[PDB]
Amino acid sequence: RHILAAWEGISELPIPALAAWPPSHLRWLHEPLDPVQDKAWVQALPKVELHCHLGGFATHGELLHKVRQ
Amino acid sequence: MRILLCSVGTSWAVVPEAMQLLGSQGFDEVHVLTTASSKISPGVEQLLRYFEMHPGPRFSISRVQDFEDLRSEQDHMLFEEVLWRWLLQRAPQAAHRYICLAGGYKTISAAMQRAAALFGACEVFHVLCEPRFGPQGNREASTLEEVEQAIATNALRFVRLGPEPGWPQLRLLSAPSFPLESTLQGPVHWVRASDMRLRQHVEGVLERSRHILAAWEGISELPIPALAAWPPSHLRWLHEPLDPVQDKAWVQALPKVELHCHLGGFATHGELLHKVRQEAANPESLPPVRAIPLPPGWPIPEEPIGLERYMRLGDNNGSALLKDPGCLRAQCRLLYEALLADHVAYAEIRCSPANYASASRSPWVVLQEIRNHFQQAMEETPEDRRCHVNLLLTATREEGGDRSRIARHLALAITAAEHWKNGCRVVGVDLAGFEFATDFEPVHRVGLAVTVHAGENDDVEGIWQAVFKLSARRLGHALHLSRSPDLLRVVAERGIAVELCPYANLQIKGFPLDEEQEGSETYPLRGYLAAGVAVTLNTDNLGISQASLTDNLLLTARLCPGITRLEVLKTQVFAAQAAFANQAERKALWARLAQVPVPTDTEQ
Amino acid sequence: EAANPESLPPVRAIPLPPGWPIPEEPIGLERYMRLGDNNGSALLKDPGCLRAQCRLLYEALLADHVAYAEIRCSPANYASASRSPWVVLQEIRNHFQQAMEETPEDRRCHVNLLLTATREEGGDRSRIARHLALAITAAEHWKNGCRVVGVDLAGAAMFATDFEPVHRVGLAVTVHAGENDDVEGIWQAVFKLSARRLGHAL
Amino acid sequence: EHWKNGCRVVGVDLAGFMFATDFEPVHRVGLAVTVHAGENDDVEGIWQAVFKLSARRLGHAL
Numbered sequence A: 001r002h003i004l005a006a007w008e009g010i011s012e013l014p015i016p017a018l019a020a021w022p023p024s025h026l027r028w029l030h031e032p033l034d035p036v037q038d039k040a041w042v043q044a045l046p047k048v049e050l051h052c053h054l055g056g057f058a059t060h061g062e063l064l065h066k067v068r069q
Numbered sequence B: 001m002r003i004l005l006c007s008v009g010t011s012w013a014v015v016p017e018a019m020q021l022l023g024s025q026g027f028d029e030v031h032v033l034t035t036a037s038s039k040i041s042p043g044v045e046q047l048l049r050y051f052e053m054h055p056g057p058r059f060s061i062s063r064v065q066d067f068e069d070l071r072s073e074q075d076h077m078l079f080e081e082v083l084w085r086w087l088l089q090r091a092p093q094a095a096h097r098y099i100c101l102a103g104g105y106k107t108i109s110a111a112m113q114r115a116a117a118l119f120g121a122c123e124v125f126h127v128l129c130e131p132r133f134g135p136q137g138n139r140e141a142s143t144l145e146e147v148e149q150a151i152a153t154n155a156l157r158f159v160r161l162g163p164e165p166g167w168p169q170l171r172l173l174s175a176p177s178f179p180l181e182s183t184l185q186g187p188v189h190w191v192r193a194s195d196m197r198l199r200q201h202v203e204g205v206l207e208r209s210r211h212i213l214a215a216w217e218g219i220s221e222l223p224i225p226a227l228a229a230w231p232p233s234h235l236r237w238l239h240e241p242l243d244p245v246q247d248k249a250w251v252q253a254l255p256k257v258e259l260h261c262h263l264g265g266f267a268t269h270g271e272l273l274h275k276v277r278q279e280a281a282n283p284e285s286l287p288p289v290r291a292i293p294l295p296p297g298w299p300i301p302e303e304p305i306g307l308e309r310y311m312r313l314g315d316n317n318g319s320a321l322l323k324d325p326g327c328l329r330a331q332c333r334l335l336y337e338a339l340l341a342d343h344v345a346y347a348e349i350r351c352s353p354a355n356y357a358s359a360s361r362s363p364w365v366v367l368q369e370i371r372n373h374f375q376q377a378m379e380e381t382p383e384d385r386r387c388h389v390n391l392l393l394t395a396t397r398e399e400g401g402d403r404s405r406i407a408r409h410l411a412l413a414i415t416a417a418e419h420w421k422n423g424c425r426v427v428g429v430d431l432a433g434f435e436f437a438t439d440f441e442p443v444h445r446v447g448l449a450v451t452v453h454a455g456e457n458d459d460v461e462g463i464w465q466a467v468f469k470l471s472a473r474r475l476g477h478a479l480h481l482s483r484s485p486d487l488l489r490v491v492a493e494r495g496i497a498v499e500l501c502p503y504a505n506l507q508i509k510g511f512p513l514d515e516e517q518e519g520s521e522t523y524p525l526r527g528y529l530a531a532g533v534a535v536t537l538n539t540d541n542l543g544i545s546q547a548s549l550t551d552n553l554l555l556t557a558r559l560c561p562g563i564t565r566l567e568v569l570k571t572q573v574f575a576a577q578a579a580f581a582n583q584a585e586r587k588a589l590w591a592r593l594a595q596v597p598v599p600t601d602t603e604q
Numbered sequence C: 001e002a003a004n005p006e007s008l009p010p011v012r013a014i015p016l017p018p019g020w021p022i023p024e025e026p027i028g029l030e031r032y033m034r035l036g037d038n039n040g041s042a043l044l045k046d047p048g049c050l051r052a053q054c055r056l057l058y059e060a061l062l063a064d065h066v067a068y069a070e071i072r073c074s075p076a077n078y079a080s081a082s083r084s085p086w087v088v089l090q091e092i093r094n095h096f097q098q099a100m101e102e103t104p105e106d107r108r109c110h111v112n113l114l115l116t117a118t119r120e121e122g123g124d125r126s127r128i129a130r131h132l133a134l135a136i137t138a139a140e141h142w143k144n145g146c147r148v149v150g151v152d153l154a155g156a157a158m159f160a161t162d163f164e165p166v167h168r169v170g171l172a173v174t175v176h177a178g179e180n181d182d183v184e185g186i187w188q189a190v191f192k193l194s195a196r197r198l199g200h201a202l
Numbered sequence D: 001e002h003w004k005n006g007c008r009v010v011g012v013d014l015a016g017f018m019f020a021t022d023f024e025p026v027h028r029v030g031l032a033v034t035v036h037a038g039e040n041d042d043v044e045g046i047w048q049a050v051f052k053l054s055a056r057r058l059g060h061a062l
């Protein structure tokens, strides 16, 4: 059901696996992002990092103390 | 709102008992579909009597005039069609749709179940009544008093099979598109169906959905998403080697993309040359028709003839001939006609307006005339079949000659880039030479795309300089990429398209044809494809080569052994992505590409 | 005479230094440029305001008895999303050609055009490229009447600009001398840019 | 060229160059270049990174 319903307009979805998503979930995906309420969904997302300096990771706090130890 | 579309046959008690599935709430309105058999009459009067009292819900009766008994299968098909039409009409929404299948024949009950599956029903139940009624108390309620007793004694067990959403494609079918012929006869409706379009539409939708679900798995390996709706046999046919002969008609119908085509090499001989000459404005200035003999076996020469002979093979048209306005107009119109005959959806033509300028006609005038001829030809064609033409300016490097033409062409391109923002546009410059970086910073500063045209050399330094010095977004005739793994990897990574002209390459350079397996001299098309390079197949010169885009796509089957048809579709997609078009033209091209011809020889 | 009076910018208030035209003290170049901010690209993007400028200017040369003039224009500064730089130049040329032909051939001031490729304070050399390409395109287009006769280099990038193409099409080059005493600048104009005239070489 | 599996060196990021004279060797060997923008609100640097440094990514191009 879900795949056929979302088949029309499948080139507008970044990940092609989103077609099998329920239509209500796709409508939610098309709604503005909520930082307070969407913390868990973003936290569980598989992400790609392309800009991260190694020398600016543990610059203060417990991480810095661990690095020094 | 809550409706209940029930079925009545010899037993009319189904409807009154079905009127209590919810209980005290009942149904705001109910309907019944049955046959026109005479035996169904007394049940109809009993139902009307039952409706006389408890007239809370709405009431109506519909019988099929062409289906009474179960003595035929065509009658069964007609009954199914009428049931679907009546469900569409008397039940606009399945969310507010309660369906009862207790009444009707066994085939009738199956029809209600199948219709609920196809079009969806908010809830499907089956009404039951204990036989503790009637004489002897061994028969179920079959009269008004007995029906009320059953409804008043809780003698009706209701089995609900659960909601049933149906098919997304079968939930947006409005009844007005499937009208049912009704004839008011008293307090009942006599419904009839004209055509069986509904059943054919449902069957086609179901088959297409099954094909889509079967192809869902490998949806990222299909160049065009619309290929998932093909039958699995078709998708298997698409993975087999391309047949140069049997597949001619399938390739001829493909919507193709042309990226490497020269305006001056189109009508170089034959009848097209004579038509172009006849169109001339002043027939006296026409140069005499030189005698240029084609090599034996043309367009497939026995041995390669190099680039100088190939270029000289088209001296009857071009700079000396297109200086006539009428000849230029005929050239443009005939080129657009040839593009239309090949089903090309997007084409980039290469022109040298400075070569066609005269005392009274500046390069700007020639360029404007070419652009307006192509735009007028485009506008004279239906949008569904219209080939979109864009223009590239060729800034060639003469052998120690006129270097002012390069400057004139670059300035012309930079000006035409802003001049036109719709229809036929000037989208880039073709650099046939350097195979000079200072001359092209202005080209990059205004957003013009650059394509470098390799020729008469097999060096990788030229390709390296074009990629990293000229910032070329496409490469023409880069037949020696495999000879440098770093260069090939860079080309694949940066997404630089490679323009290949099968016939032109074969005639100028020469490659083995119809071999068995890929040797060290085979055409590099499949080696490039396996390396991740965006490869596009083009014509170069329609006239000098005597080959169309279809002919080149077919010859790829002999230059490359085992090349599949999915590979030609991939080349078309690569060309669509590598075109210098804007968002609107790109959308139109992608809409056109989504219509691939259906194979006809999928039987082996 | 604006065609779209609903788009004309408000008439900014610009005060002239006391003693104009003869100031009591040199006001520099930056203050000089700002003094003309009520006209130019602000007003000349209007098709109707670009005619009054071209006609109110030709009758100022007639009242001064000028016999030959070369006007410096920047057609790319007046180009909108619907009027390309070539359309603006196409119009400036024909607004001067039309005015010339409507004057008796005895008091007719002959007007030619120079395209000013001004160095920009953003490194944005796209404007330079468009003007140089426009001048090369208009050099061959018009052989009679009003003509584009050269480019005005009002300003190291130009030495990396490859001004050779303008030389190959027969265009002349004029260079404004910078506000600094850059003797090394006038040297490169004569021998690198092949300038045939020098502006403000004091 | 040393490593071909696992963790690899896939490119270099220029951090304030517009000057690609000493970068032809990196493009020759196939190393991708990402140009990292500075605190200056200039667009000429972006043009040089795109066409002079042949950058494939841009950092903080605001």
Ligand SMILES: Nc1ncnc2c1ncn2[C@@H]1O[C@H](COP(=O)(O)OP(=O)(O)OP(=O)(O)O)[C@@H](O)[C@H]1O
Residues within 6 Å of the ligand: A053, A054, A055, A056, D015
């Ligand atoms: N957000 C940033 N913008 C610009 N430069 C940065 C930024 N973050 C780090 N850098 C610079 O990147 C350079 C190299 O990166 P990295 O942080 O890994 O080096 P480092 O020697 O450990 O850093 P540092 O001594 O500056 O903390 C450092 O010199 C730092 O100045």
Ligand SMILES: Nc1ncnc2c1ncn2[C@@H]1O[C@H](COP(=O)(O)OP(=O)(O)OP(=O)(O)O)[C@@H](O)[C@H]1O
Residues within 6 Å of the ligand: B262, B263, B264, B265, B314, B317, B318, B319, B320, B350, B351, B352, B355, B394, B396, B432, B453, B455, B504, B540, B541
């Ligand atoms: N296959 C090719 N390989 C390399 N250069 C080519 C090829 N085909 C055309 N050219 C170059 O393109 C230039 C302009 O292309 P076009 O075919 O439109 O020629 P033209 O304007 O008719 O002039 P002419 O045929 O007299 O050279 C030609 O002068 C030729 O130098």
Ligand SMILES: [Mg+2]
Residues within 6 Å of the ligand: C033, C036, C037, C039, C040, C041
């Ligand atoms: Mg001003």
Ligand SMILES: [Zn+2]
Residues within 6 Å of the ligand: B260, B262, B453, B540
């Ligand atoms: Zn070619």
